[PDB]
Amino acid sequence: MQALLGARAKESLDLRAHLKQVKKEDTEKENREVGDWRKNIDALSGMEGRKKKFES
């Protein structure tokens, strides 16, 4: 009896997991190449005197 319902469930999960894998493949393939920068501030610390430019 249950062959048709089994096949229907199988095809449903197959298509869903298919779309899912189409996503997760290139998801995991590139998941560290997507980093960012540090954004540090100088805080005017590395100068031991007056600047050479006109602003100081």
Place this chain on the structure above:
Amino acid sequence: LDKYSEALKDAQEKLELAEKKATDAEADVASLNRRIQLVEEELDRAQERLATALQKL
């Protein structure tokens, strides 16, 4: 007079340099406080977002 004037140009130059050191050190007290608050804010936010992530967990 030359000795006081010179002692002064030197106390005054050392002062401009000490004041500069203070200005720059202060520029950095402030740049550090900005970074500290930016990082403390990112930390508090990381912790707010953590508490949220944990709540969402």
